[PDB]
Amino acid sequence: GPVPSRARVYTDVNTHRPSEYWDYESHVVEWGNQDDYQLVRKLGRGKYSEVFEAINITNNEKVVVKILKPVAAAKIKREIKILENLRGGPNIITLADIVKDPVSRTPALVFEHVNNTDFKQLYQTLTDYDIRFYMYEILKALDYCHSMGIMHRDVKPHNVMIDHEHRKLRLIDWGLAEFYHPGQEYNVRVASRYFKGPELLVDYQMYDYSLDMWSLGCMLASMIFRKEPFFHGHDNYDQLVRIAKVLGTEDLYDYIDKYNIELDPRFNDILGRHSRKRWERFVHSENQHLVSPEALDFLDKLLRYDHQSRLTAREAMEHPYFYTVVK
Ligand SMILES: Nc1ncnc2c1ncn2[C@@H]1O[C@H](COP(=O)(O)OP(=O)(O)OP(=O)(O)O)[C@@H](O)[C@H]1O
Numbered sequence: 001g002p003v004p005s006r007a008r009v010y011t012d013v014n015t016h017r018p019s020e021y022w023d024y025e026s027h028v029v030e031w032g033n034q035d036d037y038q039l040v041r042k043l044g045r046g047k048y049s050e051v052f053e054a055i056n057i058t059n060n061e062k063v064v065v066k067i068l069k070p071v072a073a074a075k076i077k078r079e080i081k082i083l084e085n086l087r088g089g090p091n092i093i094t095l096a097d098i099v100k101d102p103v104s105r106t107p108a109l110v111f112e113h114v115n116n117t118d119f120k121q122l123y124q125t126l127t128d129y130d131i132r133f134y135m136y137e138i139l140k141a142l143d144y145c146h147s148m149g150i151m152h153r154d155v156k157p158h159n160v161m162i163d164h165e166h167r168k169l170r171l172i173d174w175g176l177a178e179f180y181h182p183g184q185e186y187n188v189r190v191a192s193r194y195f196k197g198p199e200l201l202v203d204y205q206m207y208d209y210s211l212d213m214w215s216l217g218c219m220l221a222s223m224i225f226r227k228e229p230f231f232h233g234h235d236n237y238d239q240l241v242r243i244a245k246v247l248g249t250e251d252l253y254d255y256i257d258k259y260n261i262e263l264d265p266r267f268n269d270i271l272g273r274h275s276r277k278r279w280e281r282f283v284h285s286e287n288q289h290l291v292s293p294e295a296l297d298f299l300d301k302l303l304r305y306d307h308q309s310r311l312t313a314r315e316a317m318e319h320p321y322f323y324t325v326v327k
């Protein structure tokens, strides 16, 4: 069968911590008072929750309430444990409280409010300097959660909130996050289609923190090249073909050979034979202002089929792409 794999960093974090840290099933939730919060307006409804802007009437402060849809108690206690473990970490959304919603009879997570800049506005107006600045801020959040034995598994633009006026960034929506345990087989039905790592697309379950780095690479590529999304697959199979049209098929076959993976036979008549493309092929007069040799080198080191070969968040912070960023 497949060859096992482990992260090259933060491998032993969860074994050295007390079991209470990662055993989220055993965690006893400390319930707050639901009357402290007055719902103001529905912000959205996702697959697993309804999000509302609300006011904390005990301090007059704006909050965001996420009322979970009844799904599975295991998924709920896991998100709570991760948010509590990560609380106070750099650029990590702060969980302010946990209440029982009187209508849904389900938990409602209360978060600090971010006066966030519109997502299209961000996509359309962030400068070269702003992309480097904010990528550096995401890297602080990712290295923190990875050093804490947690993988996000849903890195994408909508999950990265920016209040551009205050140059404030927050990594949100920890509902797909999981504790990393070496040798554990994880569910590959994670991350949004355009941000899914090749490991997910080839059904390799023994993945790790490096999945977040691929997703970050997809975000970066879309920003610097002005192509939204960068890898535009019609479904999970065509998503891998879209990647192969850029990275090529030879390195893909080397990847599956290394891990003794068998590609789903549906790929035999759709994958084709593609050479790896040079990143300069995606440069044009409308994105030249966001591209540099340092940006292309950085991207190249994130977007690699072999998960073990990608830059870690801490190595990524050392990259020349960030030398211009004020620290
Ligand atoms: N802490 C927060 N502060 C301010 N707004 C938030 C906060 N958390 C979530 N939101 C906002 O809540 C609204 C609804 O979010 P939801 O979870 O439904 O994600 P989405 O943008 O709707 O979709 P997806 O994640 O699937 O792309 C979004 O506009 C999101 O920006």
Ligand SMILES: N#CCc1c[nH]c2ccc(Cl)cc12
Residues within 6 Å of the ligand: 119, 122, 123, 126, 130, 131, 132, 134, 135, 157, 158, 160, 161, 162, 219, 222, 223
């Ligand atoms: N794509 C896109 C837009 C965007 C949303 N959140 C972001 C965080 C960082 C950067 Cl560079 C860009 C974004």
